[PDB]
Amino acid sequence: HMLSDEQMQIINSLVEAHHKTYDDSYSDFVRFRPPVRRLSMLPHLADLVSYSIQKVIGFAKMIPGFRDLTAEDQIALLKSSAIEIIMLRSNQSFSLEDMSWSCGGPDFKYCINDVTKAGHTLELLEPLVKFQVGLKKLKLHEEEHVLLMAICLLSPDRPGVQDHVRIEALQDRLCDVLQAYIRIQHPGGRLLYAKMIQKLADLRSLNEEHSKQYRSLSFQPEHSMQLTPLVLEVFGSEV
Amino acid sequence: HMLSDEQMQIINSLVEAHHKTYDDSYSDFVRFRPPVRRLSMLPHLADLVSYSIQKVIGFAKMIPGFRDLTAEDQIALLKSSAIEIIMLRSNQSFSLEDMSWSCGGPDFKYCINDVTKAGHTLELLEPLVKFQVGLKKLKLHEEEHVLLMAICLLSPDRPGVQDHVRIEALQDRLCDVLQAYIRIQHPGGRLLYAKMIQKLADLRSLNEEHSKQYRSLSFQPEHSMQLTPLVLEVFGSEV
């Protein structure tokens, strides 16, 4: 069997949107408040995360069907999935040799200890690193990686989602594409799809744990004041 | 004539509070989002200003009588005078040779053009530089400079001020101290006091113009998102 046009156009659109919103040179990191090794890494990681949110939004607006939803639904999907999309795109810089994220220079090489200095515990970081490694091992093609992100961001089962029917249809179509592609263009990817869908489940638990820890941080003004206006908006609960 | 104890203790308290909240090495500037020469200087100047607000608050809490006021009054005084206090403390780094503010390295040497890249017009910057130069020329002693800042921050004629009577008394006492000191310890300072009080009037106009221009900036989310949570709170109108 083979893939159809309006199915391959979807893959080309997503791949191009990812390239348009993911800087391989990481040349914007020098513009963030510098990293410093109470919670010394918060300023830098807050800027890193704020900047990633902007990228995720740019990516989302290019997912076919996303721009047609209501602003309320677009926001509901972004706010509830943003951290999961960030965690997925960060895998691109994850390294199985040092279990860290390397983004250009040694200054921008994040260890599990660095995130700790941003207010997080191993309760989150442990499962997170485990997730990164598991995903890194699936050796996804750029096409599957980008499809996984679009499928994640287009989940109708998120709090605040209104037009659950139209979003269910957009995500179903993205799922077919991923299934067809793995079956046709990924030699040895017999069990891949199920393992990918499994990764979305893992993300739900990480999202849940990240939200708790973030809530704790946002309730302490000496820490929340270190965050950016975009981070406070997206991770805030003032919907 | 000579100065009394509880009048000299006031001067020692203010001078010490200023030293405790004003870093002569400017070693914290490297922690701000780096300067970049639409509104390229906004990230850096927003961090500079956010950091100065924190210093002004630290200074205010050490002004005798300030910590006893109501939280509402302390906040009302801080929000309405913060920019004026920032402008006064920045004169310490102002240079009459280059009409710029020099804070350590060449990276942290601010020109009137830099502020322009933070969203401001000559409508403000012109009077501002003129103010800086006029004040720089008064060649104030550290004692008068610090007294001028405390007198400015303890002005009862600010919107939101409730206990206008107690604040009027705190500022009157600070004014006597400044008058006595100039008369007793400042050879040639016959006309100084009036020129200093004149500088507070000038600050009112700068504050007024700065507020307009800031309001314009805060209404555009692509710009307000570059600000910090503390700057948004202090310069915001959500009292």
Binding site: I75, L230, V234 | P221, E222
Partner: peptide, 10 residues
């Protein structure tokens, strides 16, 4: 309010 997100979503 989400004014930043609205602006960014164009």
């Amino acid at each position: 309010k989400h004014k930043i997100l609205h602006r960014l979503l164009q």
